[PDB]
Write an enzyme that holds these catalytic residues in place. Structure first.
Site, short mmCIF file in Angstrom:
data_model
loop_
_atom_site.label_atom_id
_atom_site.label_comp_id
_atom_site.label_asym_id
_atom_site.label_seq_id
_atom_site.Cartn_x
_atom_site.Cartn_y
_atom_site.Cartn_z
N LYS B 22 43.91 50.70 48.83
CA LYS B 22 44.80 51.51 48.02
C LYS B 22 44.73 51.03 46.57
CE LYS B 22 49.33 50.56 47.75
NZ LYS B 22 49.71 50.53 46.29
N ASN B 23 44.78 49.72 46.38
CA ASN B 23 44.77 49.14 45.04
C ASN B 23 43.41 49.06 44.33
OD1 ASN B 23 47.48 49.02 45.45
ND2 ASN B 23 47.62 46.79 45.64
N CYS B 117 62.09 47.29 38.94
CA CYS B 117 61.48 47.39 40.26
C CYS B 117 62.18 46.37 41.15
CB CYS B 117 59.97 47.08 40.20
SG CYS B 117 59.14 47.03 41.83
N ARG B 122 58.74 42.94 36.30
CA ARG B 122 57.34 43.33 36.16
C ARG B 122 57.02 43.96 34.82
NH1 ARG B 122 55.50 46.20 41.70
NH2 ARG B 122 53.45 45.64 40.83
N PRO B 123 57.16 43.19 33.73
CA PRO B 123 56.86 43.75 32.41
C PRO B 123 55.37 44.03 32.31
CG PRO B 123 57.00 41.40 32.24
CD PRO B 123 57.49 41.75 33.63
N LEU B 126 51.47 42.19 28.76
CA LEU B 126 50.07 41.77 28.71
C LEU B 126 49.12 42.95 28.56
CD1 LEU B 126 50.08 39.02 31.50
CD2 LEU B 126 50.33 38.74 29.03
N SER B 164 46.84 38.19 35.65
CA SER B 164 47.39 39.52 35.89
C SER B 164 46.34 40.54 36.32
CB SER B 164 48.09 40.04 34.62
OG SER B 164 48.34 41.43 34.70
N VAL B 165 46.54 41.10 37.52
CA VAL B 165 45.64 42.10 38.06
C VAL B 165 45.68 43.34 37.16
CG1 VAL B 165 45.22 43.70 39.95
CG2 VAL B 165 45.91 41.34 40.44
N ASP B 307 50.82 40.34 49.09
CA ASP B 307 50.91 41.54 49.91
C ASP B 307 50.79 41.24 51.41
OD1 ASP B 307 49.32 43.94 47.59
OD2 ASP B 307 51.36 43.16 47.71
N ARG B 399 53.86 55.05 51.36
CA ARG B 399 53.24 54.84 50.06
C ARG B 399 52.09 53.85 50.17
NH1 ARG B 399 56.91 52.94 45.14
NH2 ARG B 399 54.79 52.77 44.30
#
Ligand SMILES: CC(=O)N[C@H]1[C@@H](OP(=O)(O)OP(=O)(O)OC[C@H]2O[C@@H](n3ccc(=O)[nH]c3=O)[C@H](O)[C@@H]2O)O[C@H](CO)[C@@H](O)[C@@H]1O
Ligand SMILES: CC(=O)N[C@H]1[C@@H](OP(=O)(O)OP(=O)(O)OC[C@H]2O[C@@H](n3ccc(=O)[nH]c3=O)[C@H](O)[C@@H]2O)O[C@H](CO)[C@@H](O)[C@@H]1O
Lengths: 420, 420
Positions: B22-23, B117, B122-123, B126, B164-165, B307, B399
């Protein structure tokens, strides 16, 4: 899904009447499960949490309704069901307070174990632990906390290792009908605990030390009934004083209790506000000035209350200077920050701390409410932000504030409730 | 409101087909905003997140639909709108990925700033910061992150201070069309990042180092198009391997990628599971044995993935012994613990750590889902708990997992979707 439409920059000034504390009325209503004679409660706010409690109470056999005068009349003389169902408990975890009085008076009780809550981890291990020390046998079956006791509870020394409002109240409630004397060391000191204790005493209880960390309760056979006026809500008062502080307005809160907001009042003064305290009112005049940033650290009463944390976060986001906000009660109660950032606010979170940088003006846009007490900060932001602001999911707000739109409009705010 | 009804103790065994990540599909779909020629994506899972992305894409002028073969055909040759609206963005914060390609290709873009969230702060500071270093001017107006650039972006050295992904992907996307070369130091290494980079390269990009913390991108004038098969979903695979591990069953995952689950696989083995890895499949055989508790610490790839944290929390709650679960990615991703405690689980939280005590059996009851990936733990618990379990608000599950009921039923689970 109801939402609030709030309009551009406004100076919030005027008078507002403070209602009874939601968190004093709630525990008092559950404590009423102990009353064998009629109860009459006045100054009980009109908000969802009260309605949910009444629904739970009614399904236990309690006859309770608010009359045309606004007073809540309650008759718990014939409770014939001893379970607070999952369907209701899941909507308001405070319903855990039903277990203590049920087992103390009827020697058996059942309440759905509260699950997860957005703002943080909120187990009730201390409640169970305290009741178990009083002589109750408790088990968890099919998602229900089941309590049982063969005989009357037995009073003993109980040291709650963490400062807990809820646990302090469950134990105290149960202790009023236990044999002998119970001593609650490290008890939470919140004003609502003092009020519940006063309520129980008016019905025959013998509780002393409420308000201190050392509570003494001399158990009695049964409690009767009484008429009680709920203590003013310090959080609603704080919220309205903040409304003036963030808008440079002047607000007068009517029917307040002078000494339940010392931490909050001191911070408002530290921020540059002029506050006048009389026996029955509190007036904050911001003299049309911008706030000066102030650090915040939440803690058990009499320290700074977590229920005023978001409100002050907003004050800091529009103040002059930088500030550090530390939350020690609920580690995840910063949901309002990113919603406020959307409006032009500046802040960075790190653990249980948020570092804010005050800005001159916020700008309206759509934001989402999620905390019954904290989210009020978003509605207040709408009142002072430029243009239009839409606060969605206000049903949360309705749980912790009565007639919020009317009280705010009464201070000059342009707010309207709509859907779609 | 759809819910799942899952029934008593079951041995989950059999075969299950793993879908595309999904990601990986999500960032690839947003990266497609860069394609000037047709794109064909295969192995794209059928779950809500994909549908939401398609809705956002379509309102930009992109023509995209999944055909009868299940493949996703996309044509972004005529994007004429450059805003991802609040109404859609609020449902899936990952939509922030639309900003980077839009400004890189069209020199302007607008995306609603993600608000709060549940799982944590979760800013996207970046992402903005990285695009700004490429030459973009960004401002926040009326709740929208507005990006602009007078000319083509300019490649430069960029050191993301946090792993950060999302930021690694935004920057990489934008860098493919920048002038000169961009270098992303401290880049996240997740397998989905490798797949997106491979996808972009098939369209003319020149990205090397993907999978490492040092990414090199040689900007090009424009990207064309391609056909791409999405990389297998390591999290769906992990979830099904766990299904066998917690039920003592034997499960075979088809169409898997061998090396994207080393941390997860090692922990499963540490827990007493026998796992056989072939080039295209992974088989876990619990040999009908109870799991042995194992400590868990979440971290960026190749470490243990957040996850998979809840999934392993469940494994520990029914294992033998005590374990320590530490979450370093999202500090508030333990919502599933109290829901699992309702089912008979034993655990205590302290900050970003949870200490669990394994129990022999869980018991069915009603629980609420709230995390699209983590809440799957609740459905799995229902499969191995005694009696009946009701998982409410499964829309979250929909989702992050495709045909979850069918895949689980295919392993012997008794689960049915209902409402009311
Ligand atoms: C109905 C009501 O009056 N709610 C108020 C009450 O909540 P609440 O009853 O939860 O207040 P508590 O003071 O008991 O507890 C606060 C902290 O103690 C922890 N804890 C509590 C009990 C327990 O058995 N174990 C445990 O670990 C909680 O996880 C939390 O971190 O006080 C909070 C702090 O003033 C307010 O914000 C709430 O609005
Ligand atoms: C659509 C998608 O692929 N979502 C995944 C992605 O989310 P996500 O894109 O948020 O992942 P990130 O790796 O970027 O960030 C994780 C941590 O970094 C912080 N951060 C991130 C960006 C930024 O600008 N500033 C900042 O402080 C976040 O607050 C969080 O604490 O990775 C997570 C960790 O593998 C997964 O659980 C999510 O399911």
């Amino acid at each position: 899904m109801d939402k609030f439409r709030v309009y551009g920059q406004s100076r919030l000034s005027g008078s507002v009447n403070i209602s009874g504390a939601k968190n004093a009325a709630l525990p008092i209503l559950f404590a009423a499960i102990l009353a064998t004679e009629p109860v009459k409660l006045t100054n009980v706010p009109e908000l969802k949490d009260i309605e949910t409690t009444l629904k739970i109470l009614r399904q236990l056999g309690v006859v309770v309704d608010r009359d045309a005068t606004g007073a809540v009349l309650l008759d718990a003389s014939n409770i014939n069901h001893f379970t607070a169902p999952y369907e209701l408990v899941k909507t308001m975890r405070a319903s855990i307070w039903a277990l203590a009085p049920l087992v103390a008076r009827f020697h058996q009780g059942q309440v759905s174990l509260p699950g997860g809550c957005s703002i943080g981890a909120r187990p009730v291990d201390l409640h169970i632990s305290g009741l178990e020390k009083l002589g109750a046998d408790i088990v968890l079956e099919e998602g229900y906390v089941k309590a049982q006791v063969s005989d009357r509870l037995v009073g003993t020394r109980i040291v709650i290792e963490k400062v807990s409002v809820g646990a302090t109240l469950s134990i105290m409630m149960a202790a009023t009908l236990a044999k002998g004397t119970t001593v609650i060391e490290n008890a939470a000191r919140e004003p609502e605990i003092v009020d519940t204790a006063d309520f129980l005493n008016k019905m025959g209880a013998k509780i002393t030390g409420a308000g201190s960390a050392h509570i003494t309760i001399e158990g009695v056979e049964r409690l009767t009934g009484c008429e009680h006026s709920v203590v003013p809500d310090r959080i609603e008062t704080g919220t309205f004083l903040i409304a003036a502080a963030i808008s440079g307005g002047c607000v007068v809160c009517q029917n307040t209790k002078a000494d339940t907001l010392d931490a909050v009042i001191d911070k408002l003064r530290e921020a540059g506000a002029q506050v006048d305290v009389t026996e029955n009112s509190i007036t904050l005049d911001m003299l049309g000035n911008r706030p000066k940033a102030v650090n915040i650290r939440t803690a058990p009463h009499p320290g700074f209350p977590t229920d005023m944390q978001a409100q002050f976060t907003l004050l800091n986001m529009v103040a002059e200077g930088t500030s550090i906000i530390t939350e020690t009660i609920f580690e995840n109660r910063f949901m309002h920050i990113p919603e406020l950032i959307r409006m032009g606010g500046k802040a960075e979170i790190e653990g249980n701390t948020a570092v804010c940088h005050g800005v001159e003006q916020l700008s309206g846009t759509e934001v989402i409410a999620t905390d019954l007490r904290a989210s009020i900060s978003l509605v207040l932001a709408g009142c002072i932000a430029t243009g239009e602001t839409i606060v969605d999911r206000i049903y949360h707000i309705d749980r912790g504030y009565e007639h919020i739109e009317d009280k705010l409009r009464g201070l000059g705010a342009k707010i309207e409730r709509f859907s779609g």
